[PDB]
Amino acid sequence: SQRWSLKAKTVLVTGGTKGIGHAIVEEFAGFGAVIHTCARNEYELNECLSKWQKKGFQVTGSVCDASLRPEREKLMQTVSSMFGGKLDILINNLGALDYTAEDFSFHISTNLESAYHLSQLAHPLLKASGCGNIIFMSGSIYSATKGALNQLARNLACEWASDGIRANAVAPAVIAGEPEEVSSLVAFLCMPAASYITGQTICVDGGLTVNGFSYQPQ
């Protein structure tokens, strides 16, 4: 039906050349969505774009270091011009001899800033779509980042609902199957069929029970 279709929906997925981001691009491409992605290494971008267009996938890309403010502004500029000022889906895929406090601080703030800024740059585009979706896809360092990201996600969901923008966060399992499998949940959340789903922070962990009591990632 039309509710379970992502056909011709415009998507921006950061870091689409590898890992979950690459799996997310393919998942959406399988549904006939129009995707734009980015990466720092232009040759690997070229490599993926090549292997994709042959599979009949509608994907374009640009070189970008999403950790840099000016790079994020240019990226969204490229996206607005190619999608005609409208963007249906934004997949904020965060980047993945012992880390110090400065390292801890830097990685957490770089991740949180890129995701926050990217969402703000896309806001007007997402608003013009009339049915925009944002997905935040992202130990110790990761846990704290995830904790911050979930909150931002829940805030934007309430803050931008009147603009018709939904926001959800998704995390791969801690205890496992390929973690890339989560791409299908990401896709479902962006379907009209899931228009009432917002503010969710889902971790598809295997989970565990002790003495009959369940335990899951916090």
Place this chain on the structure above:
Amino acid sequence: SQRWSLKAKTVLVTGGTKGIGHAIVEEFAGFGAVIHTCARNEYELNECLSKWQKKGFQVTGSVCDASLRPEREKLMQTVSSMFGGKLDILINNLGALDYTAEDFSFHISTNLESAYHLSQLAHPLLKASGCGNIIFMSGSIYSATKGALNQLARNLACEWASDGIRANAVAPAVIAGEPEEVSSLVAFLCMPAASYITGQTICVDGGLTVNGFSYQPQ
């Protein structure tokens, strides 16, 4: 009893001249604990130290901008020398025309870095105590910070338990009584009576129920 006593326990509380930090200093001082606190404004520090010593409170202080690495190293140096290399309690009290992404990022990383670093600087001191305690006391900006801090708290609780160090996070209510009242929960958590309590992230919110269904701060 001895389990519910904080008498002569050494405490470092950051930002003790105002708000909850000031309430925490007084709460512990009421229990006969020995406290060291800090602040950027030396005159207000002097003001509090004066009003405190008269009440018979055992509190010393030093000027410090906990947002600066070298300032945090000096602070812990002062604490180690005055408490004899041992520290029982560390109260990481975070600092409290619209914020941008850089502002968002800066405040969250400055808070998370100060708290993380301060805990690492105190670690050896807390370890030498044999029964150390750490408390992390701390919209949109706050929510994300809190989300990150809670995770760090839960991590240190598991990571440092073998050193005899417990770690818990406490947050004042969102929906209310003075928010400063939470100082008593902070004090309880640091008592030998609460030695088995670690890894907790407690928000003493008023809470609310809708149509019979409860809702609380995430």
